[PDB]
Every structure is written in C-alpha cells, then in structure tokens.
Amino acid sequence: SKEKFERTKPHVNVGTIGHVDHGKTTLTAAITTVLAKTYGGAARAFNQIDNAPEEKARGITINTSHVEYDTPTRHYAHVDCPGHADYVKNMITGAAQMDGAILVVAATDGPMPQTREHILLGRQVGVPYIIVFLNKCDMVDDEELLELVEMEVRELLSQYDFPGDDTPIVRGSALKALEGDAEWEAKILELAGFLDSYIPEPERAIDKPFLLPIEDVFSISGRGTVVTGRVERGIIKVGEEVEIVGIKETQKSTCTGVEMFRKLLDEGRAGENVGVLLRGIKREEIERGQVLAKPGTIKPHTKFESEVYILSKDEGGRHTPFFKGYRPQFYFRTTDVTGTIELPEGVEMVMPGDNIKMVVTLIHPIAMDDGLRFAIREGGRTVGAGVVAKVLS
RNA sequence: GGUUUAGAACGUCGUGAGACAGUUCGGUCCCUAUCUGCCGUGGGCGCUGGAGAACUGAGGGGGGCUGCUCCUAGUACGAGA
Numbered sequence: 001s002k003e004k005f006e007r008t009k010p011h012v013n014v015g016t017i018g019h020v021d022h023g024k025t026t027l028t029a030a031i032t033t034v035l036a037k038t039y040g041g042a043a044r045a046f047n048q049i050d051n052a053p054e055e056k057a058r059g060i061t062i063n064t065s066h067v068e069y070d071t072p073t074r075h076y077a078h079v080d081c082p083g084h085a086d087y088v089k090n091m092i093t094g095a096a097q098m099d100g101a102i103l104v105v106a107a108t109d110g111p112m113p114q115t116r117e118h119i120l121l122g123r124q125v126g127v128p129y130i131i132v133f134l135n136k137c138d139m140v141d142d143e144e145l146l147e148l149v150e151m152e153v154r155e156l157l158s159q160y161d162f163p164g165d166d167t168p169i170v171r172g173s174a175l176k177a178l179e180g181d182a183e184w185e186a187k188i189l190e191l192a193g194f195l196d197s198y199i200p201e202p203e204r205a206i207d208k209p210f211l212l213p214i215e216d217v218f219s220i221s222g223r224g225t226v227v228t229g230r231v232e233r234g235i236i237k238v239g240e241e242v243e244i245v246g247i248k249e250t251q252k253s254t255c256t257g258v259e260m261f262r263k264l265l266d267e268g269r270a271g272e273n274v275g276v277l278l279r280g281i282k283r284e285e286i287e288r289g290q291v292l293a294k295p296g297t298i299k300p301h302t303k304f305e306s307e308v309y310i311l312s313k314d315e316g317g318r319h320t321p322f323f324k325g326y327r328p329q330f331y332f333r334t335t336d337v338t339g340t341i342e343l344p345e346g347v348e349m350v351m352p353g354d355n356i357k358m359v360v361t362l363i364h365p366i367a368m369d370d371g372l373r374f375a376i377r378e379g380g381r382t383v384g385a386g387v388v389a390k391v392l393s
Numbered sequence: 394g395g396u397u398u399a400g401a402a403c404g405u406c407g408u409g410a411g412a413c414a415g416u417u418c419g420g421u422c423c424c425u426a427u428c429u430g431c432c433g434u435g436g437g438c439g440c441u442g443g444a445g446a447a448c449u450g451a452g453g454g455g456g457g458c459u460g461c462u463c464c465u466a467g468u469a470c471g472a473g474a
C-alpha cells in the first residue's frame with residue numbers, strides 16, 4: 001500500500017488445476033522464478049505460496065493463493081487452487097474467477113481420479129480455455145512412456161468435451177527450473193508463450209452497472225475490513241456508494257480505496273481481482289458469498305423458478321430418481337447453499353439425464369437475477385447445471 | 394515396616410480371669426569361618442642335564458542391548474489422508 005499501479009497491458013486471470021501432490025503449487029513457484037529472472041518483475045519464492053501451520057506440517061494446500069507475474073504482452077494474475085477432493089468448495093471460487101486454466105497431469109502417475117473431477121467442475125462453472133503441463137518428465141527417462149500419457153490427456157479432454165488435440169501440451173520439470181538449468185528454464189519460458197498465444201484477450205463488460213462477488217474477506221490492521229474478488233461487471237471509483245447484498249440481510253456502505261496486489265488504484269475495472277476497502281463495517285457482519293453491487297441494481301431472493309439440466313451416469317451425476325424434499329448444494333457465483341425442491345404439477349419423478357423446470361426454496365437468500373448460471377452438487381460430486389427463470393421471494 | 398512374647402487402649406464376646414488373621418500406639422535380630430564352595434594371591438615338587446627368554450594353542454572365561462534423526466523417498470502403497 002504505497003506504489004500506484006499504472007494501468008498498462010491487459011489483465012488476465014490464470015490458475016493451476018490438477019491432481020493431489022502433482023506439481024500444481026510447485027508450477028506456480030516455477031513460473032515466478034523463471035519470469036522474474038529474465039524479464040525483470042518481482043521475485044517472490046515457493047515460500048508464502050503456502051505458509052501457515054496447516055500447509056507445512058502436512059505440506060498440502062488448502063487456501064487459494066494468488067500470484068502476480070508480468071510479461072511484455074499481458075499482466076497475469078495467478079490462482080493456485082488447492083487440489084484435494086475435500087477442498088473442492090473453496091477451489092470453485094478460485095476456478096470461477098479464473099479465465100484460462102493450466103491443467104497439471106504427471107508423466108509418472110498419469111491422469112488420476114481428481115484430474116477428471118477438476119476438469120468436470122471447470123466446464124459447468126466457467127473455464128473457457130485450458131493448457132496441459134507434464135510436471136515430472138525427468139523421473140522417467142524414456143521416449144515411449146512419456147508420450148503415452150499425452151495420448152490419455154488428449155482423450156480425457158475430448159471425451160469430457162474440450163478441444164483436446166488443439167490444446168498445447170508442454171513437458172518440463174518444475175524442480176529443475178526452480179534452480180537454474182538452461183534447457184529446463186527455457187522450456188517453462190515456452191509455457192508463458194503458450195499462455196499468450198492460445199488464450200485470447202478476454203471480453204469484459206465495462207458498461208452495465210457494478211457487481212463484485214466476494215471470494216475472501218480480510219481485516220487489515222489500521223485501515224479496516226477488506227473484500228477480495230474479480231469484478232464481474234462495471235467499474236469502482238473511490239468514495240462511491242456500494243450496497244452489499246446476499247446472506248443475512250443488506251447493508252449500506254462506501255468504498256475508501258481499491259487495490260491490486262498491495263498497490264493503489266483509482267478505477268477498479270471489470271474482469272480483474274481487486275481488494276475493496278469498506279467503510280464502517282466489521283469483520284464478522286460481512287461474510288463470504290455476498291456481492292458488492294451498486295445501490296438499486298440487484299435484490300436478494302430466497303425462492304425462484306429455474307430450468308435445471310440433471311446429469312446421467314454417462315455424463316457424471318445421479319443415477320436414481322428423487323421426489324420433492326431433496327436437498328443438494330447450489331453453487332451460484334462463489335458460495336454454495338442448500339434448498340428444498342418443489343416440482344411442478346404433472347411431474348411424478350425426476351429421472352437422471354432430463355431437462356425440466358422447478359421451484360427451489362433456499363435457506364439463505366442470495367443476490368440473483370433472471371439468466372444466472374449455477375452448478376448443482378451433492379455427495380462430493382456434480383449433479384446438474386442450469387439457469388434461473390423467474391424471481392418470486 | 395508386617396507377622397507372632399511380656400505394657401496399654403478401642404470396638405466386640407465373656408458374670409469374670411481373659412479372648413478376637415478385628416483395629417490401635419510401644420516393643421534386645423548373637424557367632425573371630427575348621428571343611429566344601431567361591432574371588433584373589435603365593436610356597437612345594439613335577440615336566441628326566443641345568444638355566445634364561447620368546448611363542449604355540451587344548452581348554453576356559455568375557456563381550457553380544459538399543460532409541461532417534463536424516464538420506465534412499467514424501468519413492469513404492471493409496472481415491473485421499
């Protein structure tokens with residue numbers, strides 16, 4: 001909080017995806033040290049990508065850590081997702097804001113059960129583009145074995161509905177590029193080139209009014225309570241009226257400073273992760289899931305009609321019917337929420353792999369409008385995608 | 394210290410003397426080692442002229458415990474932990 005962030009180069013939200021203990025967080029650390037050395041950005045280290053007691057005694061990552069590496073063309077903003085099956089909830093918030101992912105499959109183990117689950121969540125939420133990275137390579141010195149894994153990833157993406165063969169696969173060790181090997185340093189400089197070439201300039205919405213889903217809340221010692229997240233649409237000027245909408249009720253507020261990776265800003269534009277400082281609000285009363293909207297634009301609702309597309313055994317979801325009373329998790333912009341289902345008159349049961357509409361009464365009210373996309377989940381797996389039809393409350 | 398003498402008391406049984414793995418407080422533990430054994434340490438003669446050294450080894454004894462950390466490797470194993 002001192003240096004002013006100069007608005008140059010387009011902003012892009014990137015993040016690593018993949019199996020547990022597969023080189024996902026280590027890739028993030030490899031991208032910093034490579035890009036910082038040659039081009040001349042800020043250095044950083046593997047340290048702080050994940051500190052705490054939880055991510056040291058174990059070694060695993062829980063929190064979605066962020067990184068800011070810069071290149072001549074564009075200014076990237078990383079989102080290193082956790083990895084585990086148990087940490088899928090806080091991952092989806094990191095994955096929703098992420099524009100273009102970096103998948104991490106390993107040459108030794110290959111595509112594992114979570115790799116299938118992570119890419120499954122990427123499609124239904126909103127991950128337009130994806131890039132593969134083989135994160136072991138050196139451990140198995142062979143030409144035939146390493147190339148057989150590349151075939152299975154191309155099959156995985158094409159089976160689950162992506163381009164597959166068009167996606168640029170890259171090979172390279174993360175640990176070898178951490179130190180200073182000339183052949184392996186240049187091979188991850190190549191990944192930065194694939195990030196620029198494949199993923200296009202993202203289409204923002206700098207016209208329709210201000211909205212910002214809160215991914216994680218903070219309490220800065222001195223300044224006040226702060227909320228982070230990607231600005232979904234519109235802009236934010238300093239000293240402007242902002243209404244916080246979502247869970248509990250609704251509160252008036254005013255912005256008193258927006259920032260971008262510990263650097264000041266005047267205008268917080270759309271499609272970029274920013275930390276908004278709020279005036280006269282406590283850490284407890286504001287929570288994760290709520291949205292920073294401009295007053296009057298959006299209203300919180302606890303009941304709505306919605307066209308739900310349930311999945312089958314083949315697509316990956318439920319395989320049995322269910323009657324009114326069923327309570328799955330509904331993942332809107334960031335947070336999840338439970339709700340009872342009231343089916344329409346003339347529909348006795350809901351079979352798997354079927355398009356229908358239904359009334360859903362949620363326990364917590366969330367801010368929503370007509371034409372909002374969500375992904376239903378229940379029992380550590382997906383259920384179905386859909387869209388909102390009508391407001392009731 | 395306990396049990397198991399002589400003092401005294403409580404509860405209990407007994408008319409009473411007294412009694413009770415019922416309880417309670419107090420209450421002398423001797424022996425210079427002949428033999429066997431054992432740990433040490435010598436004198437005698439023997440071993441075939443005597444003497445001084447240096448070995449050999451039959452045989453005997455002693456010694457044999459194990460933690461943690463770190464690499465191999467967060468590798469096999471495992472959906473993950």
Ligand SMILES: Nc1nc2c(ncn2[C@@H]2O[C@H](COP(=O)(O)OP(=O)(O)NP(=O)(O)O)[C@@H](O)[C@H]2O)c(=O)[nH]1
Pocket residue numbers: 019020021022023024025026027059060061062082083084135136137139172173174175176
């Ligand atoms: N030899 C070698 N080891 C690697 C390479 N990349 C990653 N690893 C190893 O893979 C392990 C996993 O590290 P990390 O990336 O933090 O795990 P993750 O992929 O983020 N998943 P999670 O954080 O949920 O546990 C580490 O022990 C690391 O040494 C590589 O290129 N070569």
Ligand SMILES: [Mg+2]
Pocket residue numbers: 021
């Ligand atoms: Mg492993």
Ligand SMILES: [Mg+2]
Pocket residue numbers: 024025026060061081082083
């Ligand atoms: Mg990780």
Ligand SMILES: [Mg+2]
Pocket residue numbers: 109
């Ligand atoms: Mg393995």
Ligand SMILES: [Mg+2]
Pocket residue numbers: none
């Ligand atoms: Mg006594």
Ligand SMILES: [Mg+2]
Pocket residue numbers: 397
């Ligand atoms: Mg006695």
Ligand SMILES: [Mg+2]
Pocket residue numbers: none
């Ligand atoms: Mg007496």
Ligand SMILES: [Mg+2]
Pocket residue numbers: none
């Ligand atoms: Mg007696």
Ligand SMILES: [Mg+2]
Pocket residue numbers: 415416
């Ligand atoms: Mg008694």
Ligand SMILES: [Mg+2]
Pocket residue numbers: 419
């Ligand atoms: Mg006395």
Ligand SMILES: [Mg+2]
Pocket residue numbers: none
């Ligand atoms: Mg005495």
Ligand SMILES: [Mg+2]
Pocket residue numbers: 421
């Ligand atoms: Mg005495």
Ligand SMILES: [Mg+2]
Pocket residue numbers: none
């Ligand atoms: Mg004497």
Ligand SMILES: [Mg+2]
Pocket residue numbers: 431
């Ligand atoms: Mg003897």
Ligand SMILES: [Mg+2]
Pocket residue numbers: none
């Ligand atoms: Mg002797």
Ligand SMILES: [Mg+2]
Pocket residue numbers: none
């Ligand atoms: Mg002799």
